[PDB]
Amino acid sequence: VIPIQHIRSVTGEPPRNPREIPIWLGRNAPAIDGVFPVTTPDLRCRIINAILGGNIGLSLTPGDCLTWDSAVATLFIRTHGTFPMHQLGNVIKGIVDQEGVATAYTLGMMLSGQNYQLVSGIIRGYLPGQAVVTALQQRLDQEIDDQTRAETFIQHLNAVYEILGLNARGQSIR
Amino acid sequence: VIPIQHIRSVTGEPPRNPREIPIWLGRNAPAIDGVFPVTTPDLRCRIINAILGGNIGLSLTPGDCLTWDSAVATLFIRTHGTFPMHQLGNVIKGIVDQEGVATAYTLGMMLSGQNYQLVSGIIRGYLPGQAVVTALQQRLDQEIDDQTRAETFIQHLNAVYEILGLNARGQSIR
Amino acid sequence: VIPIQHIRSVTGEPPRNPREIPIWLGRNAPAIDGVFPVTTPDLRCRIINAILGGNIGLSLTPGDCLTWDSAVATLFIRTHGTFPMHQLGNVIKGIVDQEGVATAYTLGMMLSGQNYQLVSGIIRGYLPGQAVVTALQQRLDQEIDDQTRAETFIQHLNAVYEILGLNARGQSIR
Amino acid sequence: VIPIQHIRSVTGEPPRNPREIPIWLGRNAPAIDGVFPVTTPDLRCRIINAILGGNIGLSLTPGDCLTWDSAVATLFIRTHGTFPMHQLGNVIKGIVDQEGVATAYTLGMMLSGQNYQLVSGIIRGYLPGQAVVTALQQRLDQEIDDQTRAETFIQHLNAVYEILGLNARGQSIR
Amino acid sequence: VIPIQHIRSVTGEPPRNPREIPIWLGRNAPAIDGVFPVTTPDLRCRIINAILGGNIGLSLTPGDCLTWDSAVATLFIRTHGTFPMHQLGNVIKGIVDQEGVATAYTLGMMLSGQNYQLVSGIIRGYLPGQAVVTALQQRLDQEIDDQTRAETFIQHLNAVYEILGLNARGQSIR
């Protein structure tokens, strides 16, 4: 017996519009990993199919549930009909206005197969204000390599936002 | 003590209109099998009667709960009043517009006692577009026998839909 | 610790109108017995008092909870103010229109202290159509005795309804 | 880990108006004792603080949770601002119209520190009809002492109400 | 498997407006500690991230979850964009009108890093009525030192409010 109700308490009911189901799963995925440990592709497939309830159209098989990124990407092709990387710039722009830059980096990297150069370049255009772009680049440039920059991107954004008095959604205190 | 609440988290509350209770059970049946193992006809009868709550009219006895298909079919005769195979073409046409082709194959086969020839022929008429009909037939024809075609029908539909840029409900990206 | 939440998942919240609380408990009683075994009068009293929540007026003591029938009957005297058998014909007529004949036989026998002759005679008047009355009587008459007829009444109604194409609520396919 | 969810299934969400929180706790207290055993003042304090959720204003300390009566009385001084016994007659009159006489005896005795003479005298004025007052007094007078009358008051009200055809809220069948 | 559902029963769903999420966590924090014991910074981080569900913007790392005060303060900088102590007087004034003085002392001390002198001085201005200010000061002055006054502040407010017939929100009985 998989403990579905604890997982259902963290996630909640699926979104009504089929198009917003892939983004929802990506945002709730880190919290699920902390509350319950998922160690095999088969366990992940059973949890995702139960959370979405009776959606035969969006059912996933054990092969496509190797990593959380693969599961979120497959749901995108079933809900939208296009592979994600073809229109990544538009998808990141929608998340930034509705949720914020930190949500866009996490979901953009899941859909982009962990490509730091493409995600960092697209996000830099939509960062809030000229000062934020210059300050963040200086801090990231000091890091030794692309792997180290990828791990510390969210930590370096939070420090810059705090100095300039911006909330998570980028709205100024003034 | 059967763990009803985990099963209730996956399913949800029964539909208010008595006519849509049989289709609802069919869509939620695969997810229930993954979360909790059902191994006997008696266990299935107790789970179905609890999920529908206090519906004395639609109660099922252990004899008619031998397989999930038998349980869904018996509810159809109590909710609608006609055996399913008498009007299968109309039932499949309703599911395709509301949910999609993949939901119609799974529920059509449960109501049709696993008849591949009748279900495949009815679905081919309602497939979206002339190109989808020709492409799917070529892939299915290559398979060795009817049992092998039945197992791979959903896998071969998903590949064709992805090439032609169609979502699960059959709506084009254009 | 009694497992109240599993029992609450099957039942649901009590009805707002005090008059419909006795019928609600009768319909949900068979499902509760399957999910959790109730073996003593004391356990039944604790479960019924928790399900109704904080209703001091309708609280039941261990003495009146000997059988599910005794508990449903006592709630009727507290909600309505009259003993049930005094107005049984009217109560059965209300259930038949709202739910169906099968619900009326189960709840009519609980309120009537398992009297087959009174319940069968009252139901025969409200059966749907002249043909249903004649067909059911022929099948019941063949049975050896009143105990055997009481066990097989619902099974013999379902067979007659299926032949004449009627749904559980008695509405014809035509 | 205290099993809060089973206790939350019996109780429900707290009332929005701060004034009706003390009466709500009193009505739900007997059911909680049956489902889960509370044996220490500390356990009671932890359960009451969790049920009311995040109400820092109405938080209770282990010292004032010695008995369920002490906890309900302390919430009355925080929600209303006056000790209960100062205005007991008005409080009992409100409960009788909204819920009934049986709810008023149970909650009146909790707020009145188990004083039979004051609660019985206040209730006798608001009993429904002249006949109910005379019949109940005759039965209570036969009992040997005040402790015996206190235990059998609700049992003797239910018998009188049944003979005169009154529902729990005191409304006649006519 | 962390028992998230018991914690979710005490807390409830997060507030929709991002600005009121920090105050909500502070009010629900004492109840969570009683129901489930939290002994490590890592366990606290996993519980807070699950309770807020899928909010990537307000996610907290193990380093900033050393104490409940540190977690509530970090959420304030992400939701509002300013450190709390810069505008403490305004924050305490909002809580006093909406909830009461007792909620303002508990949340004011969490945001102010346990500074008794600043919190006590700000609260004294917003206490209800001239008599309450004089009576409370006399009782607090008798205590030996600032640590002893901090522990007994809520106990000494409740005694003064009871003598002057005030409810928790400061509204008089008159």
DSSP C20: G
Q: Please give the Cα distance from E15 to E22 (Å, whole number).
A: 10
Between chain A and chain E, how many beta carbons pairs sit less than 8 Å apart?
74
The answer for A 88-117 residues in CB contact with E (under 8 A) is 99-100, 102-103, 106-107
**Longest CA pairwise span in chain B (Å):** 53
Q: Which residues have CB under 8 Å from A72's CB, separation 6+? A: A22, A25, A26, A29, A107, A110, A111
3-state percent helix, strand, coil for chain E, nearest multiple of 5? 70, 0, 30
Task: Give the DSSP per-residue string, A81-137.
Answer: SS-GGGGHHHHHHHHHHHT-HHHHHHHHHHHTTS-HHHHHHHHHHHSSSHHHHHHHH
Q: Which residue reads 């004089």 in tokens?
A: E134
DSSP lists the bridge partners of residue B166 as: B172
Find the closest chain B residue to C106 by CA distance: B56
Q: How many angstroms separate the CA atoms of A122 and C23, rounded?
A: 63
Q: Which of C44, C45, C55, C43 is nearest to C13 (CA)?
A: C55
Q: Which helix (H) or strand (E) holds D112?
A: none
Number of Cβ within 10 Å of residue D69's Cβ equals: 16
Q: CA separation (Å) from A64 to A58, A72, A87?
A: 12, 10, 21
**What's the one-letter identity of residue A54?**
G
DSSP state of D99: T
The helix-helix angle for A116-126 and A101-111 (nearest 10°) equals 150
Contact call for C100 and B49, based on CB within 8 A: no
Amino acid, single-letter form, for residue A58: L
Put simply, the answer to whether A106 touches E56 (Cβ < 8 Å) is yes
The 8-class DSSP code of residue A168 comes to T
| Residue-wise DSSP of C33-54 | HHHS---SHHHHHHHHHHHT-S
Give residues with Cβ within 8 angstroms of E50, minimum separation 6. A9, A10, A31, A34, A35, E2, E4, E7
DSSP for A28-77? HHHHHHHHS---SHHHHHHHHHHHT-S-STT---GGGGSSHHHHHHHHHH
> Which of C31, C34, C100 minimises the CB distance to B57?
C100
Task: Tell me the shortest Cα–Cα distance from C160 to chain B, in angstroms.
Answer: 11
DSSP annotation string for chain B: ---HHHHHHHH-SPPSSGGGHHHHHHHHHHHHHHHS---SHHHHHHHHHHHT-S-STT---GGGGSSHHHHHHHHHHHHTSS-GGGGHHHHHHHHHHHT-HHHHHHHHHHHTTS-HHHHHHHHHHHSSSHHHHHHHHHHHHHSSSHHHHHHHHHHHHHHHHHHTTB-TT--B--
Residues of A in contact with B12 (CB under 8 A): 53
The two tokens of residue E45 are 């981080």
Rounded to whole angstroms, how far apart are CA atoms B128 and B161?
A: 10
Identify the CA nearest to E9 among candidates B83, B166, C4, C98.
C4
Burial B82-105 (b: 16+ CB within 10 A, else e): eebeeebeebbeebbeebbbbbbb
Long-range contacts of B112-117 (CB under 8 A, 24+ apart): B112/B84, B112/B85, B112/B88, B113/B69, B113/B85, B114/B69, B114/B150, B116/B146, B116/B149, B116/B150, B117/B146
Burial of C83 (0-12, 13-18, 19+ CB in 10 A): middle
Give the span between the Cα atoms of E134 and A5, in whole angstroms: 53
Whether residue B54 lies within 8 A of chain C, CB to CB, comes out as yes
Residue A166 is classified by DSSP as: B
Q: What are phi and psi of A135, to 5 degrees?
A: -65, -45
How crowded is residue A124: how many other Cβ atoms within 10 Å of its Cβ? 13
**Alpha carbons A48 and A65: distance in angstroms, whole number:** 9
Give the separation between CA D33 and CA C123, rounded to whole angstroms: 43
Enumerate the β-bridge partners of residue D166: D172
| Rg of chain C in Å (alpha carbons) | 17
| Closest C-alpha among B84, B6, B1 to residue B46 | B1
Q: Using only the alpha carbons of chain B, give its radius of gyration.
A: 17
DSSP A14: P
Q: For residues B161 and C47, give the distance between their C-alpha atoms in angstroms, rounded to a whole number.
A: 53
| Chains contacting B (3 or more CB pairs within 8 Å) | A, C
The answer to whether B76 and B95 are in contact (CB under 8 A) is: no
Tokens found for residue A65? 């549930």
Residue E166: helix, strand or coil by DSSP?
A: strand
Nearest CA in chain E to A160: E81
- DSSP 8-state symbol, E172: B
Q: How far apart are CA A127 and CA A124, in angstroms?
A: 5
Instruction: Give Cα A172 distance to the centre of its chain.
Output: 24
Q: Report how far residue A60's alpha carbon sits from residue A26's, in angstroms, rounded to the nearest whole number.
A: 15
How many CA atoms does the CB half-sphere of A73 hold within 13 Å?
20
Listed in sequence order, the residues at least 6 apart from A120 whose beta carbon sits closer than 8 Å to its beta carbon are A140, A149, A153
Cα torsion at D111, D113, D116, D118 (round to 10°)?
-60
Determination technique for this PDB entry? cryo-EM
Beta bridge partners of B172: B166
The one-letter amino acid code at B147 reads: Q
Residues of B with CB below 8 A from C31's CB? Answer: 49-50, 53-54
| Residue A131 and residue A164 in contact, taking contact as beta carbons nearer than 8 Å | yes
Amino acid letter at A6?
A: H
Q: What subunits make at least 3 CB pairs under 8 angstroms with D?
A: C, E
Q: Are B48 and B9 in contact (CB under 8 A)?
A: no
* Residue D3 to residue D51: CA distance in whole angstroms: 11
CB of D2 less than 8 A from some CB of C: no
What angle, 0 to 180 degrees and rounded to 10, lies between the N-to-C axes of helices E146-163 and E101-111?
160
Distance CA D61, CA D71 (A): 9
* Distance from the A145 Cα atom to the nearest Cα atom in chain E, whole angstroms: 23
Query: Which one of E54, E57, E79 has the shortest CB-CB distance to A28?
Result: E54
Chosen for mutation from C1, C8, C28, C35 (greatest number of chain B CBs closer than 10 Å) is C35
Q: Would an 8 Å CB–CB cutoff place D9 in contact with chain C?
A: yes
Minimal CA separation from C83 to chain D, in Å: 9
Mutate to test the interface with A, among B152, B167, B171, B174 (most CBs of A within 10 A): B167
CA-to-CA distance for B72 and B114, rounded, in angstroms? 13
Q: Are A26 and A110 in contact (CB under 8 A)?
A: yes
* Interatomic CA distance for residues E23 and E30, integer angstroms: 13
Mind telling me how many Å the CA of C121 is from chain D's nearest CA?
Answer: 27
CA distance C117 to A87: 74
Asked if the C-beta of E24 comes within 8 angstroms of chain D's C-beta atoms, the answer is: yes
The span from the CA of C75 to the CA of C68, in Å, is: 11
Residue among D47, A90, D98, D54 nearest E20 (CA): D54
Is there a contact between C56 and D106 (Cβ–Cβ < 8 Å)?
yes
The two structure tokens encoding residue D8 = 């939350």
The CA distance from A13 to D108, in Å, is 43
Alpha helices, H only, C16-99: 21-35, 41-51, 68-79, 88-98
